Design a protein around this ligand. Structure first.
Ligand SMILES: [Mn+2]
Ligand SMILES: [Mn+2]
Lengths: 278, 278
């Protein structure tokens, strides 16, 4: 039951220039994380440089995350996105990360029911091409269940449909995203357990006005510090220990509290809950 | 002073299957719009049937909108995104749309201040290749000022810096997005007037909790029906009339009110304000 810190959780401070990637790695080390989950949106940093930072701070990468448009209808773009996915797998090899997580589409690019219906077999086809490459390189490929419901990979049923058609594909369960999709997060873990090799932990609190995140049941949702919202982390941890889960628990925070403070506060809660289970 | 309906404003009902594209075109005609502004996320609709729908309902396309990653760091992907942009221009020719609007990056793909700095010259170089192609096809190419501030095309200064480096490039001014960026919308119009060939009209109201849109000055923002928020549309209309603006005013709504109701309500307000000017 090791914890990893998503670099995406620190994106506010990376965007302001207050933290660079090495600062995020050093902060993860200082806060007792076993790994980082590295969001990769370009290859501008050399592998040598990242490896140096990891060695300096005695840190590992548990998983590399990327957004890739595997729903692309244009053949040349679709093919280049499969190629980009293979480049990401190569980066995992170079950086000793055991796993990749792809978000295989973009919500603004699905603008109708027909678009969603067409995106699904396209995404499946792409993953059927990418996963064998990942396997040949010794890398575990996952997708994440998402929060924008026009994407055909949010509900338990949607993610199961993909996983059952892509040999060897695994799942990063974003526990909080399941709430947005109208699912019970614990039931999602139970139904998808055999596929779950990685997990994202984030929390939500209910609001009165629009947020750009409304779950299927109508409740307005705002990112919450972990333990201050509605997600029951202890029940998940109890089931995971019961089932001898061996993956990482990745800290995700998408809110507006200072990112370092949010990590310190939320990890206090998550560690307390895990200790109650252990 | 003509009005166009963004098909994006109807995206909720297209995603739910309640409206198809022809329904949006017929709705626009029934509500007295001169045109639609068509969001194009794929080429799956046949040009012949779109043209048929437009003739049936006596409607036009004022502008085609698309999202393309012109900041892509990987050369193969970047070149294919230039090619995709040229294909979008070809669709504008096939559909008799006189104008294209590109959103030239994706906010989740800019994860640091360094990424923003590197993205800007990349986007400019792409637009320097795409704009002569548009010119060769008689199409006016625009970008839109955006709302996620990690993208180097949100402030007045950022948009002006791009426009002044790309001969013939023009601007779709999203009046509400300027408010997100901490600018005065009317001042944005005044400073960018010579480039503005299309405009998006949307409104915002002020809220207390997290929304995924925080204005640069700290106010949390919620999509508003036009006239119920803080954007002064009459001042803009007065200046556009004084300057004899010849483009379209495009109706944008990103909120959760039923999309047909939102069009009817917001257009009542906007037409009243325009009538007060004339
Ligand atoms: Mn996640
Ligand atoms: Mn707009």
């Amino acid at each position: 039951m090791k914890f990893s810190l998503m670099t995406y959780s620190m994106v506010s401070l990376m965007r302001s220039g207050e933290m660079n990637l090495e600062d995020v790695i050093a902060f993860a080390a200082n806060e007792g994380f076993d790994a980082i989950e590295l969001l990769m949106v370009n290859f501008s940093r050399s592998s040598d440089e990242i490896r140096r930072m990891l060695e300096t701070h005695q840190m590992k990468i548990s998983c590399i995350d990327a957004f890739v448009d595997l729903a692309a209808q244009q053949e040349e773009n679709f093919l280049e996105n499969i190629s980009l996915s293979q480049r990401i797998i190569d980066q995992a090899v170079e950086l000793s990360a055991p796993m990749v997580m792809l978000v295989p589409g973009f919500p603004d690019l699905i603008a109708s029911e027909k678009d969603k219906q067409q995106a699904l077999p396209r995404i499946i086809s792409a993953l059927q091409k990418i996963t064998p490459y990942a396997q040949s390189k010794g890398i575990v490929l996952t997708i994440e269940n998402y929060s924008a419901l026009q994407m055909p990979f949010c509900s338990i049923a949607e993610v199961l449909t993909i996983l059952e058609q892509v040999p060897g594909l695994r799942l990063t369960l974003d526990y909080g995203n399941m709430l947005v999709a109208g699912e019970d997060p614990l039931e999602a873990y139970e139904k998808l357990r055999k596929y779950i090799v990685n997990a994202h932990l984030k929390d939500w609190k209910v609001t009165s006005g629009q947020t750009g995140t409304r779950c299927a049941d109508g409740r307005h949702l705002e990112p919450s510090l972990h333990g201050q919202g509605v997600i029951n982390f202890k029940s998940l941890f109890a089931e995971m220990v019961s089932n001898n889960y061996k993956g990482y628990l990745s800290f995700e925070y998408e809110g507006d509290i200072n990112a370092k403070e949010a990590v310190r506060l939320g990890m206090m809660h998550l560690r307390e809950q895990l200790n109650e289970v252990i």
